[PDB]
Design a protein around this ligand. Structure first.
Ligand SMILES: CCCCCCCCCCCCCCCCCC(=O)OC[C@H](COP(=O)(O)OCCN)OC(=O)CCCCCCCCCCCCCCCCC
Ligand SMILES: CCCCc1oc2ccccc2c1C(=O)c1cc(I)c(OCCN(CC)CC)c(I)c1
Ligand SMILES: [Ca+2]
Lengths: 100, 49, 48, 284, 820
């Protein structure tokens, strides 16, 4: 439910970033997604330990589902953060927080 | 409008959307682990087994 | 006099050899464990 | 400054008094080289004979210091420190009737640098060439600290379990395998020796030296890994302790940033320093 | 005579190189008989040109000066041979004098004699700093004798050759620590000599830390200096379908084919994964065969590679060698990518340029190999137990004692064992010297050669310490002096291709841009903006980060740390709240450092709640509090500038590292195919932590070999005669048939290639920073105008182009005399 709340918060941030020239709001939102996906990782970890306390176990349908969800959330959040960040200066004049 | 109207951020946002949808489906789908001690088909989930 | 030089070392071995075959004795070298048993029983050859 | 009441020996300084002192220091270095360190308070005839010869060097150095101190710093402070430490050790070691003060006798070869101006200018250039490396030194220190803290949080108390023989306290290994950590009912490794059981109480892999148990040991092992001398051993031990999947990320990256990146930085800075020094000297 | 002399010196070189251990008697007769004939030819060629050009001017060149010494030494040696010459070691060394004749080859190339004129001057000028290095080594050897001399008296049977018992051994140990090979073992021995891993016993490691770092720095320094100085005189004296969619489609499919080639099962002949990969391979081949018909119809050196790859893929549905030729799939991308082709052309030009130093290095390695053959031929044999000194003695069984306990013994058969790296012939000697030059396992060869007793007898402990000289000079000459001129060669080579200060100034002036500052209105938030922007606040929070770092390092194996964690998390959350309120969340997220702070604060918060809910009733979330001091980079100007200016250079050459990635991929796939079925055995170099069984494992093995671990032991563990994997498919009766001698070609090449490309990557990245690295910070620099931009932004909260003139008048008072 913590990760669901993070997903919700990232959703409102992303939706609000598209209006009134609020491009900057795309920066925090990605993190939420990342963190949400990140939580899912440790979430399945807990399931793993349950599997390690109770014979043969198999992962068939929803394990790949959760793994793909976590991978998509993490990678998309990182890519969104990198894209929203302006640039590496690469020039002596160029720097972060410049005039557009 | 460079990092908003660009397609490379819109495809990323679509990936985020499909990811959140698939994560929500994963929570409901409590069928990611079958335990057979070896008639006892067991499904494991985070909310309800 | 039977003299034994034991172990791996850089010290001079001449004086103990002189002690050995000056006083009608013998000189032995024991560099490792596996050389102990054979070298602690050859003094009976001299005594015979 | 003061009148000629004591400075009547300033003339002999201009004499080739430096060549005989250089030969004396060379003889002292030779005497230091031929000394044979013996275990557990043992000695031979030569070592006893060198403990008396060092009195000859000490008195010569002291009289040189006395002649130069009354006739009249720079490089001469090191000479005074060396002679004072030597005299202090000599007078202290003969009133107890520890030996750590003798370790100060190895600074005497530095006096050769005081005797050759070319060595002085070379050492001055070397000292001046290390100032631009301050930022790289700070970066290396901070990266070592960060990686040491990460390893302290990740692998603390993990490499303390190995498999001995059942019922004994003898570590179970094979022909050419150094003792390695172990894990029972975990992600680590089980050992395949027949009569072996895995348990704790093991000091550590390298006789209890290589582990992330506290900050000092973690810092030491991180520094050892940065030199790329035995970092794979630490990686393999962590793999045997906690599992194979994750730990490489900690180590490979440490090699990529702590070793290759830092070496590139220092090589670039040194090359720039040499190039600009050559360019500056070309204009003259 | 220009060709006659080269013919006779080539014949002499062949005769010298033909000598090996256990050679046939007729070979020995041919060797000593041919010595007289070639010596006579040398003599007659001496007296011919002596009359041809006169006695006086024959000595004007040093090239013909040492020919006199060569002939005189040959005559003297021949005269001495027929006498009562005992001491076969003396015979070996007089024979070694003869080897000098090989110098004749070095006198038959103009470029082999032109370069010495400047290196002679450089060595004679830097002999002072070489002597300083020698004095440093002597001082640290004396210090090690004081600290560790006579303290290795351990009650075990382990052998510790690298000790400080006397001056030569301490000198050898200090040299070994300087080379960095197995220095940690010496440090462990020193620590155990004292109490152990306790408070007073560990401080001895400081010695080694001083010995290594300060030892290498000056070392690097001197040799680096030599290189550049000499290479300076090396440049001053010498100078005096066609759509992009289809191309991207093909590139993506090539990448996927390479990925499918990587992920595979080299052990199981027919696994569950293999046939899916085969279906993917045939699907890719069907896609790739329609790309060539679409080009052949519309057109007539690079397309032939694609055709060959498709042909070898299709014709495969010793023959298994064809399965190795399909590793050329990534190379096709070289045609598709223009930057990859450019960097490939550049690296080929680089190898073509470097042809005057590899030749001399290889020749010197060959000469040292011949000397080593003369010295250690037949002297690297041994027995299982050191008490047996002859092959006929080393028969039967003997006892080994576990942990050196006489009551715990086990029977082992004793066998005559030959060292894996020896000097029996020139090829094995060259292999051993190549292993030495990489500083991998060279102390083992050093202590094997010191104990060398006779031509067919076992070792004698510390028999010949003077042989260490042979192993030191070779390291000083080849592994130090000529491996640094090679690095200095490329540095000046790319220096050549690398007023202009005014050009930089004007281009930066006309290409700059103002930066926002976000000074807020509404004094209610202006107060908090002022209090959070003042240097007092940043100093306080820096001190708090330092205190947090100190608290993080106080934890140890076997709480109060929980309260401090929560307190620091709360205080940094309050930081974030205050910053958000001051900057109205608009200028807060515009700063990347505030972005990092937000990420770290959120991560720390989540870690705190996770710990609390664990206690009220995952390990990498504790890494968020560690990253906090990374934000200290926002205060260190010099460190941040250096990091940025090197990260920019690394990002500016994504194709130079792509060559390294492609080399790693190709060699990993080849190693999987070749050394894939070797069983994982503890105590060997192929085990659970080091093998070629999967792509990640092979890449890790290659990375380990790159950094200079025991890669020669991995090479020896992959040669022919190893036990095959039980799960692999092989005919019964042949279990010890896995591995191949191709490992010798596999590793030796890779190292060199991995040693080359990395150096390339190191130099290009340096070149992009040449303006910053070679910068005069006094006359002018971009930092002055950067701080001027800072003042402008302070007086111009918004960019808005330019502002009132009286504003610029005030800035002029803030402009320093360096700028104005
Ligand atoms: C104002 C003055 C400020 C202070 C300046 C002091 C002088 C700075 C000296 C910098 C260090 C010089 C290092 C020279 C390295 C020479 C290259 C070498 O051989 O070592 C590089 C080593 C990898 O070893 P290598 O032998 O290349 O491996 C085989 C390759 N296949 O890889 C490495 O070891 C690379 C990482 C080197 C890091 C050195 C760590 C110590 C530096 C100081 C830390 C701060 C100390 C503060 C007090 C605690
Ligand atoms: C196609 C192969 C090109 C690269 C190459 O060929 C050589 C032939 C002979 C000797 C060296 C090379 C060589 C190198 O690029 C090379 C190899 C080594 I090993 C090497 O030394 C590595 C650093 N150190 C080892 C720890 C010793 C100085 C250096 I610098 C360059
Ligand atoms: Ca090494």
């Amino acid at each position: 439910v913590f990760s669901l709340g993070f997903l919700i918060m990232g959703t409102i941030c992303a939706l609000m970033a598209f209006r009134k020239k609020r491009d900057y709001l795309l920066r925090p939102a990605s993190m939420f997604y990342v963190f949400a996906g990140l939580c899912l990782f440790v979430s399945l970890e807990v399931m793993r330990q349950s599997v390690k306390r109770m014979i043969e176990y198999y992962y068939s349908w929803s394990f790949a589902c959760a793994c793909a969800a976590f991978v998509l959330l993490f990678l998309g959040g990182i890519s969104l953060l990198l894209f929203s960040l302006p640039r590496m200066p690469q020039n002596p004049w160029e720097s972060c927080m410049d005039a557009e | 409008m460079s990092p908003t109207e660009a397609p490379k951020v819109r495809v990323t946002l679509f990936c985020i959307l499909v990811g959140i949808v698939l994560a929500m489906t994963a929570v409901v789908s409590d069928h990611w682990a079958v335990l057979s001690p070896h008639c006892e088909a067991a499904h494991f989930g985070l909310w309800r087994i | 006099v039977f003299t034994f030089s034991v172990g791996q070392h850089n010290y001079d071995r001449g004086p103990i050899q002189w002690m050995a075959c000056e006083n009608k004795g013998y000189y032995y070298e024991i560099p490792s464990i596996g050389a102990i048993r054979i070298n602690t029983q050859e003094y009976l050859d001299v005594l015979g | 400054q003061n009148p000629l009441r004591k400075a009547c020996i300033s003339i002999v300084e201009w004499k080739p008094f430096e060549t005989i002192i250089l030969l004396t220091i060379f003889a002292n270095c030779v005497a230091l080289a031929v000394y044979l360190p013996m275990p557990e308070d043992d000695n031979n005839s030569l070592n006893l004979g060198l403990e008396k010869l060092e009195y000859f060097f000490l008195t010569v150095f002291s009289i040189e210091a006395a002649m130069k101190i009354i006739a009249y710093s720079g490089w001469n402070v090191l000479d005074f420190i060396i002679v004072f430490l030597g005299v202090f050790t000599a007078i202290l070691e003969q009133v107890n009737v520890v030996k750590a003060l003798r370790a100060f006798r190895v600074l005497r070869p530095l006096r050769l640098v005081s005797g050759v101006p070319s060595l002085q200018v070379v050492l001055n250039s070397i000292f001046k060439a290390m100032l631009p490396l301050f930022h790289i030194a700070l970066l290396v220190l901070f990266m070592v600290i960060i990686y040491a803290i990460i390893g302290l949080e990740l692998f603390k108390g993990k490499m303390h379990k190995t498999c001995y023989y059942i019922g004994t306290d003898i570590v179970a290994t094979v022909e050419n395998e150094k003792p390695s950590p172990c894990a029972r009912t975990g992600s680590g490794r089980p050992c395949t020796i027949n009569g072996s059981e895995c348990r704790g109480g093991w000091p550590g892999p390298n006789h209890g030296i290589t582990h992330f148990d506290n900050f000092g040991f973690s810092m030491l092992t991180v520094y050892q890994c940065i030199t790329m001398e035995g970092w794979t051993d630490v990686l393999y031990w962590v793999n045997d302790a906690i599992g194979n999947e994750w730990p490489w990320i900690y180590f490979v990256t440490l090699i990529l940033l702590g070793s290759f990146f830092i070496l590139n930085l220092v090589l670039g800075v040194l090359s720039g320093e040499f190039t600009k020094e050559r360019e500056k000297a070309k204009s003259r | 005579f220009y060709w006659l002399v080269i013919l006779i010196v080539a014949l002499n070189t062949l005769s010298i190189a033909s000598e090996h251990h256990n050679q046939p008697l007729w070979l020995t007769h041919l060797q000593d008989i041919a010595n007289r004939v070639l010596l006579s030819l040398f003599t007659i060629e001496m007296l011919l040109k002596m009359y041809g050009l006169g006695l006086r001017q024959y000595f004007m060149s040093i090239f013909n000066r040492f020919d006199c010494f060569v002939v005189c030494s040959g005559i003297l040696e021949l005269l001495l041979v027929e006498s009562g010459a005992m001491t076969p070691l003396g015979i070996s060394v007089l024979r070694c004098i003869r080897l000098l004749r090989l110098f004749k080859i070095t006198k038959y190339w103009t470029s082999l004699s032109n370069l010495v004129a400047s290196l002679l001057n450089s060595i004679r000028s830097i002999a002072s700093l070489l002597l300083l290095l020698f004095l440093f080594i002597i001082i640290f050897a004396l210090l090690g004798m004081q600290l560790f001399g006579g303290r290795y008296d351990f009650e075990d049977t382990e052998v510790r050759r690298s000790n400080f018992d006397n001056f030569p051994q301490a000198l050898i140990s200090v040299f070994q620590v300087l080379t960095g090979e197995d220095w940690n073992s010496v440090m462990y021995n020193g620590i155990m000599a004292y109490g152990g891993p306790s408070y007073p016993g560990v401080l001895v490691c400081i010695y080694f830390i001083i010995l290594f770092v300060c030892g290498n720095y000056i070392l690097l320094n001197v040799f680096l200096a030599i290189a550049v100085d000499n290479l300076a005189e090396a440049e001053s004296l010498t100078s005096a379908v066609n759509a992009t969619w289809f191309t991207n489609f093909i590139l993506l499919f090539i990448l996927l084919s390479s990925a499918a080639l990587a992920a595979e099962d080299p052990i199981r002949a027919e696994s569950v994964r293999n046939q899916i990969l085969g279906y993917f391979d045939i699907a890719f081949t069907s896609v790739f065969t329609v790309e060539i018909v679409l080009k052949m119809t519309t057109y007539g050196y690079f397309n032939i590679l694609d055709l060959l790859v498709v042909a070898v893929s299709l014709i495969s549905m010793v023959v298994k060698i064809l399965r190795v030729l399909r590793v050329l799939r990534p190379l096709r991308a070289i045609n598709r990518a223009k930057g990859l082709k450019h960097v490939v052309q550049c690296v080929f030009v680089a190898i073509r340029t470097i042809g005057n130093i590899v030749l001399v290095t290889t020749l010197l390695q060959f000469m040292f190999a011949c000397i080593g053959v003369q010295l250690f031929k037949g002297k690297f044999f041994s027995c299982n137990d050191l008490s047996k000194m002859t092959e006929e003695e080393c028969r039967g069984y003997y006892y080994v004692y576990k942990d050196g306990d006489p009551t715990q013994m086990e029977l082992r058969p004793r066998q005559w064992i030959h060292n894996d790296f020896h000097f029996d012939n020139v090829l094995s000697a060259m292999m051993s010297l190549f292993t030495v030059s990489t500083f991998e396992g060279w102390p083992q060869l050093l202590y094997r050669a010191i104990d060398s007793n006779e031509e067919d007898m076992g070792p004698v402990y510390n028999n010949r310490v003077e042989m260490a000289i042979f192993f030191i000079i070779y390291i000083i000459l080849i592994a130090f002096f000529m491996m640094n001129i090679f690095v200095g060669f490329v540095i000046v080579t790319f220096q050549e291709q690398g007023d202009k200060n005014q050009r930089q100034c004007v281009q930066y002036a006309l290409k700059a841009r103002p930066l926002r500052c976000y000074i807020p209105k509404n004094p209610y938030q202006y107060q908090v903006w002022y209090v959070v922007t003042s240097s007092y606040f940043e100093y306080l929070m820096f001190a708090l980060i330092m205190l947090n770092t100190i608290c993080l390092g106080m934890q140890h194996y076997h709480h109060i740390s929980d309260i401090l964690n929560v307190a620091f998390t709360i205080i940094f959350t309050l930081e974030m709240i205050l910053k958000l309120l001051a900057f109205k969340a608009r200028g807060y997220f515009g700063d990347p450092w505030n972005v990092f702070d937000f990420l770290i604060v959120i991560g720390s918060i989540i870690d705190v709640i996770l710990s609390e809910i664990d206690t009220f009733l995952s390990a990498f979330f504790r890494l968020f509090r560690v990253m906090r001091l990374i934000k200290l980079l926002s205060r260190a100007e010099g460190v941040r500038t250096l990091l940025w200016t090197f990260i920019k250079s690394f990002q500016a050459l994504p194709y130079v590292a792509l060559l390294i990635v492609m080399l790693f991929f190709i060699y990993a796939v080849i190693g999987m195919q070749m050394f894939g079925k070797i069983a994982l055995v503890d105590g060997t170099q192929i085990n659970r932590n080091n093998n070629f069984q999967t792509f990640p494992q092979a890449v890790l093995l290659l990375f380990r070999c790159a950094t200079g671990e025991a890669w020669q032991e991995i090479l020896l563990a992959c040669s022919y005669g190893k036990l095959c994997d039980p799960e692999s498919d092989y005919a019964p009766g042949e279990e010890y048939t896995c591995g191949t001698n191709f490992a010798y070609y596999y590793f030796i090449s890779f190292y060199m290639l991995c040693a080359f490309l990395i150096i390339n990557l190191f130099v290009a990245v340096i070149m992009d920073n040449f303006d910053y690295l070679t910068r005069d910070w006094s006359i002018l620099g971009p930092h002055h105008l950067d701080e001027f931009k800072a003042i402008w932004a302070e007086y111009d909260p918004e960019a808005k182009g330019r502002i009132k003139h009286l504003d610029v008048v005030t800035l002029l008072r803030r402009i320093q005399p360096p700028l104005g």
